[PDB]
Amino acid sequence: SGFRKMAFPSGKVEGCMVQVTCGTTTLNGLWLDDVVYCPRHVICTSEDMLNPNYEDLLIRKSNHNFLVQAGNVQLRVIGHSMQNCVLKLKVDTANPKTPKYKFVRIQPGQTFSVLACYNGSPSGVYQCAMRPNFTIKGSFLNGSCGSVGFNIDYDCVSFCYMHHMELPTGVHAGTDLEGNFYGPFVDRQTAQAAGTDTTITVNVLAWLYAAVINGDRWFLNRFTTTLNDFNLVAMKYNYEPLTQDHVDILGPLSAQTGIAVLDMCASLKELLQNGMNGRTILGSALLEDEFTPFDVVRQCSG
Amino acid sequence: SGFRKMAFPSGKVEGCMVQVTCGTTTLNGLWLDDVVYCPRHVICNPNYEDLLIRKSNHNFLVQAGNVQLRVIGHSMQNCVLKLKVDTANPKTPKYKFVRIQPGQTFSVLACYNGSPSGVYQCAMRPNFTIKGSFLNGSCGSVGFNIDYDCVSFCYMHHMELPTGVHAGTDLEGNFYGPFVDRQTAQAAGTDTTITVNVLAWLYAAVINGDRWFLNRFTTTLNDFNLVAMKYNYEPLTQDHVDILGPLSAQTGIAVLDMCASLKELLQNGMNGRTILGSALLEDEFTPFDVVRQCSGVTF
Numbered sequence: 001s002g003f004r005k006m007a008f009p010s011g012k013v014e015g016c017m018v019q020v021t022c023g024t025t026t027l028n029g030l031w032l033d034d035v036v037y038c039p040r041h042v043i044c045t046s047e048d049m050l051n052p053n054y055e056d057l058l059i060r061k062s063n064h065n066f067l068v069q070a071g072n073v074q075l076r077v078i079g080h081s082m083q084n085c086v087l088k089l090k091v092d093t094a095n096p097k098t099p100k101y102k103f104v105r106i107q108p109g110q111t112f113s114v115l116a117c118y119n120g121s122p123s124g125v126y127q128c129a130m131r132p133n134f135t136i137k138g139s140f141l142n143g144s145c146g147s148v149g150f151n152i153d154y155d156c157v158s159f160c161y162m163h164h165m166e167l168p169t170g171v172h173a174g175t176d177l178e179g180n181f182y183g184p185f186v187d188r189q190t191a192q193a194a195g196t197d198t199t200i201t202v203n204v205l206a207w208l209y210a211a212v213i214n215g216d217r218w219f220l221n222r223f224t225t226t227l228n229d230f231n232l233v234a235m236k237y238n239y240e241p242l243t244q245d246h247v248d249i250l251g252p253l254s255a256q257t258g259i260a261v262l263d264m265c266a267s268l269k270e271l272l273q274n275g276m277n278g279r280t281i282l283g284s285a286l287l288e289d290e291f292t293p294f295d296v297v298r299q300c301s302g
Numbered sequence: 303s304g305f306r307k308m309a310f311p312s313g314k315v316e317g318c319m320v321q322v323t324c325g326t327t328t329l330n331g332l333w334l335d336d337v338v339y340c341p342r343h344v345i346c347n348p349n350y351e352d353l354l355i356r357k358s359n360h361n362f363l364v365q366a367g368n369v370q371l372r373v374i375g376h377s378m379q380n381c382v383l384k385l386k387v388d389t390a391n392p393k394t395p396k397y398k399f400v401r402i403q404p405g406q407t408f409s410v411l412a413c414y415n416g417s418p419s420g421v422y423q424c425a426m427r428p429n430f431t432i433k434g435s436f437l438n439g440s441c442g443s444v445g446f447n448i449d450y451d452c453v454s455f456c457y458m459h460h461m462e463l464p465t466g467v468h469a470g471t472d473l474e475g476n477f478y479g480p481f482v483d484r485q486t487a488q489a490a491g492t493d494t495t496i497t498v499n500v501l502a503w504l505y506a507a508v509i510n511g512d513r514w515f516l517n518r519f520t521t522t523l524n525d526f527n528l529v530a531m532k533y534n535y536e537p538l539t540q541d542h543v544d545i546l547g548p549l550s551a552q553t554g555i556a557v558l559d560m561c562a563s564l565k566e567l568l569q570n571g572m573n574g575r576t577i578l579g580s581a582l583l584e585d586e587f588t589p590f591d592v593v594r595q596c597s598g599v600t601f
């Protein structure tokens with residue numbers, strides 16, 4: 001019993017964190033096999049940030065300009081290349097702590113653990129979701145760039161995010177491990193704003209099923225809804241549209257609890273209309289949207 | 303910017319988790335140097351001295367990854383079983399066994415079959431329970447804090463109470479709370495809110511730009527505690543005020559000034575507003591956690 005926001009154990013990722021320095025700039029790198037991945041903006045001088053020409057800035061650099069530190073050991077950079085917004089620093093030592101890994105690009109609504117790092121040293125681990133507006137509501141200070149987001153499936157680490165910048169609203173933007181930004185963001189100091197964020201509907205429904213699995217049924221009602229009527233209502237509360245894919249994905253949780261997806265949708269519509277009335281669901285006074293259907297099954301079953 | 307419920311990096315603890323099997327029961331053990339610590343109920347009105355005397359070393363199957371460890375001795379210390387093994391854990395970190403106070407927070411590395419499954423941050427409630435997330439097989443999972451490179455083990459999971467909350471011991475086997483490791487009628491006492499932690503979280507909200515709850519008012523420690531008693535909040539002591547000093551100095555809001563904001567929040571509610579994305583007052587961040595997260599300390 002119980003339902004917590006749970007991160008993956010970070011050990012496999014901790015043994016990959018290194019410090020990358022270029023000039024006055026220091027940030028984090030991810031050391032996998034003989035390559036260190038880090039944000040390409042490590043080569044920028046802040047005066048470059050408004051309109052940096054990364055290709056022009058990178059061509060002027062040599063391997064010895066990049067200082068990579070893994071613990072108290074300095075690694076030797078033997079090559080460098082840029083892939084989208086990530087810098088790939090070839091090093092002369094393969095990381096003996098390299099876990100079984102994959103680079104995965106996630107969709108909005110997906111969750112992952114973030115190992116926040118400063119100077120190549122892990123400071124903390126927390127759980128995040130890729131917002132529908134492609135930002136993440138993280139906890140990052142200056143020096144956290146290059147910290148990564150991941151999931152662990154069996155003993156394989158799926159790296160899905162690398163931190164690049166903080167937007168003016170306090171939300172965070174980054175890329176997958178191939179350097180492709182999530183969202184319409186660029187690694188430039190130009191005027192950029194996150195789009196209007198919306199609630200991850202499928203995740204709220206998954207969390208309502210988690211509440212039912214844990215014995216909370218107060219919010220259930222005798223109603224059902226069509227998918228279209230649900231979407232017309234949910235859109236008015238800035239909730240993401242619920243698709244047939246989401247309905248299918250919720251099937252296992254519907255079967256386990258005996259509450260049809262459209263029946264749970266009717267409960268959600270009522271919660272949006274009434275609020276909670278001084279009550280809580282799984283210890284929360286707000287509807288939680290950073291638990292996916294997969295997270296609910298994993299945490300409530302194994 | 304941002305404020306998250308953050309756990310310590312779990313790596314140093316992951317390299318200590320092993321599976322312990324005795325009879326039909328499988329749970330988790332903590333392998334430090336040549337000893338595996340686990341709940342004594344793995345041998346199960348239980349007379350644990352009598353149950354333990356009937357067990358030989360080879361009855362305890364300890365598995366560290368895909369390697370079976372050989373148990374060369376066994377002894378009980380309070381509610382923890384100490385299984386001496388032939389091999390010292392090469393991954394043993396710098397560690398201490400520490401007993402924490404209610405209100406103190408720690409990270410839990412939830413484990414099943416000696417394999418870490420997740421890490422979450424929680425607090426020792428004033429009623430000595432933890433609102434954790436544990437299923438069958440999670441017993442022996444541990445709670446810890448990390449200071450510099452030293453892991454302070456402070457909790458070992460033993461059982462779930464009927465209300466879904468959890469109970470366990472320190473690493474010396476002493477229960478937190480008036481609990482016993484036996485299938486019997488046990489209930490968690492009435493819980494209260496950790497006041498010093500709510501204040502720390504309000505300072506974290508101010509540091510992150512949320513100030514709507516602030517007011518011009520101040521209060522006395524006695525008047526605040528009279529209000530705190532009414533809302534099932536733990537008494538705030540002069541020690542708590544002193545501990546909040548650094549946050550008070552950084553934000554410019556005196557501790558009793560923040561107390562008057564908290565009193566108004568308790569008597570009037572949030573009124574449709576939120577603080578750090580929460581509609582409830584959060585009490586599972588200590589003043590140290592707020593400073594550590596809003597400064598970026600590393601391990």
Ligand SMILES: CC(C)(C)Oc1ccncc1NC(=O)Cc1cccc(Cl)c1
Pocket residue numbers: 041049140141142143144145164165166172186187188189303
């Ligand atoms: C508080 C402050 C300085 C923004 O530091 C941060 C806080 C949290 N996460 C990241 C940073 N740093 C950056 O965003 C550096 C940067 C600036 C412009 C463009 C880019 Cl791509 C990167």
Ligand SMILES: CC(C)(C)Oc1ccncc1NC(=O)Cc1cccc(Cl)c1
Pocket residue numbers: 001343436437438439440441460461462482483484485
């Ligand atoms: C759901 C269920 C079976 C309680 O499993 C749990 C769920 C979460 N954390 C632990 C457990 N198991 C136990 O509590 C086993 C147990 C039973 C009686 C006495 C003791 Cl000391 C231990």
Ligand SMILES: [Cl-]
Pocket residue numbers: 105106107110
């Ligand atoms: Cl995805």
